[PDB]
Design a protein around this nucleic acid. Sequence first.
RNA 1: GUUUAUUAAAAACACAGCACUGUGCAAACACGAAAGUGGACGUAUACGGUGUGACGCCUGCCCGGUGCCGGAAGGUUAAU
Lengths: 271, 104, 149, 77
Amino acid sequence: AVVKCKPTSPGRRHVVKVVNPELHKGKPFAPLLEKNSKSGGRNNNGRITTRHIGGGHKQAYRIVDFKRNKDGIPAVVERLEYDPNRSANIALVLYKDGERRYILAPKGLKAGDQIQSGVDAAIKPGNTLPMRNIPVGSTVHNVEMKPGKGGQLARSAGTYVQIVARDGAYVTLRLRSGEMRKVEADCRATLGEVGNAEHMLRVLGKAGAARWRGVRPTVRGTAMNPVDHPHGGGEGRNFGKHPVTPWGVQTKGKKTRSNKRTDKFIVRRRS
Amino acid sequence: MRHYEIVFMVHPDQSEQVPGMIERYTAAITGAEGKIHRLEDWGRRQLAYPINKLHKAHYVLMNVEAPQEVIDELETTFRFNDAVIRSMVMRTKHAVTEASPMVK
Amino acid sequence: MQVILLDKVANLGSLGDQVNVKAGYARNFLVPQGKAVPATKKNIEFFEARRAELEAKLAEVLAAANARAEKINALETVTIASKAGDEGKLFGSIGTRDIADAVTAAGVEVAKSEVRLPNGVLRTTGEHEVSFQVHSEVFAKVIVNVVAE
Amino acid sequence: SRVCQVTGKRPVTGNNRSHALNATKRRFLPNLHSHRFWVESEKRFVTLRVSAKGMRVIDKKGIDTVLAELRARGEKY
RNA sequence: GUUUAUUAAAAACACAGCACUGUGCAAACACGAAAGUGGACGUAUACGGUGUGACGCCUGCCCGGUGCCGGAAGGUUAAU
Ligand SMILES: [Mg+2]
Ligand SMILES: [Mg+2]
Ligand SMILES: [Mg+2]
Ligand SMILES: [Mg+2]
Ligand SMILES: [Mg+2]
Ligand SMILES: [Mg+2]
Ligand SMILES: [Mg+2]
Ligand SMILES: [Mg+2]
Ligand SMILES: [Mg+2]
Ligand SMILES: [Mg+2]
Ligand SMILES: [Mg+2]
Ligand SMILES: [Mg+2]
Ligand SMILES: [Mg+2]
Ligand SMILES: [Mg+2]
Ligand SMILES: [Mg+2]
Ligand SMILES: [Mg+2]
Ligand SMILES: [Mg+2]
Ligand SMILES: [Mg+2]
């Protein structure tokens, strides 16, 4: 539920919270946690590889089942939890044999539902079964690209992928970007859209809310000197040049895909 | 309870499995304490127009007095089965038992 | 790459033939599969005086032990009670290793490179036909009924 | 290291000469490739990071002779 | 809020927000002769770059030039 904040102060003037009261108001499940040390966007050389990353609140990592291998064994949903590592909420499920795991929470999933992976799984939101067993035209998430590698597609808060076709070993997918991609028909997929669809409806309101999320401020390139950026310079506001990267590469429109290995898997590009 | 008239149209290459489908559907109804009034296989029949790139289909009529829950389950069974092509459930005022004019 | 043959290959020569091949075809397939030796004149005097009939005898006794095995591959039925769905649509398939597992459990202990399948998985309960390639020439067939558990 | 194990080829240094005879230092790298060679005597495959000249050498001398030379050189394989 | 430590604290920068565009994952990109690493133990409601800069009303015409994107019939055209 989105909640517009009352303007008791600037910085609360424009804040929209996303309040979900079903999330667990306690500590997460401790065995499935691990340390997530921050980087600052710096590699093993210490240099900044990707800029504007730094700071933010300390975050513990939640081990999430993307491979989803517990076949045949049903699992009930224990509680829903917050994950700082990702935009989607996670669900703590309890298998019959006594194992607890975290999955991505689907849209309509709540505490007490029953899920089941495997080939003999039913078709309800939450189940994970191979896409040669999944009917054409359904919305799935947590999609594998390779069998057993783990789900990599449609993991963000409100995403989903439609299955538009199948020609033997492959199924054709309609990705959330609009790209049509072939995937082997033995790759696992999880039914339904991902949960927190109103995540994009939030407004941070102030700069500190991004610094909480580890987003350092972005200095635009024309406000620099020419030694720093190609855009820099001027005796006023001057930009008499084509928009480039800090490294002189055209940004407004120029394509950068140079993978000739995966062109056979791409049916149509996005657009 | 709620008198329904169910007619479904099967892929003709799955014509051998038809009594297995009928027996599962009947055991769904009577397991749900439903009645079965008439049950009329119409056989292979030439379609008026080619659905799904094929010209014939295997028809089954079934009149049922069941609760709506097992009928919505049966509709989902028709939905996810690829053997069944079309399914039509039509609510009826009463229980009908007389044979069809095309069963004759 | 001049190379002498140890067995007949379907498009260039029979056993005891000194035929120019490409280097990657000799270096990657023929020599590592024992089918050809590069045509050194030391290899030629090694082969043609003695092995011009020594490899023809072991290749013929290999084709006679295989063509005996293909003849005895008249066992003709293997019922594999795998898991299945309703109205066909087998849950769990029978692969190459599982076919070799079942003719081992009933007949010859057979390997996976002899098995010929157009699809190969056959995740479908009922009858099918499966050809074999236990030799380069002699093939066998066993009707395998995959039955729902 | 860009060194052919068979021939001992090595990146040498030279110049890019332009049309205006502008000289810039460059390198000449060997065409090295890792390849599994079937050794029939040891009855196994041996991976060697070898140039294509060395593959012509293996096609001419044979791999057992070359691995004898590499042991007499004192080189692992 | 930040800034010229030591003559400039500002209308300059940043900002939440907006838009364009790239990117299907071994992602783009970046540091690295390379291995690798960051992005991210993330997966297009994500990430990067660029411009603008809360909010309110808005954002009109021009693709000739320069760029970029798409095209592949014809002309020209390298090593070989
Ligand atoms: Mg940035
Ligand atoms: Mg910004
Ligand atoms: Mg900025
Ligand atoms: Mg300046
Ligand atoms: Mg410059
Ligand atoms: Mg000016
Ligand atoms: Mg001007
Ligand atoms: Mg000089
Ligand atoms: Mg101030
Ligand atoms: Mg200061
Ligand atoms: Mg000062
Ligand atoms: Mg001052
Ligand atoms: Mg990486
Ligand atoms: Mg400005
Ligand atoms: Mg304008
Ligand atoms: Mg133009
Ligand atoms: Mg062009
Ligand atoms: Mg030209």
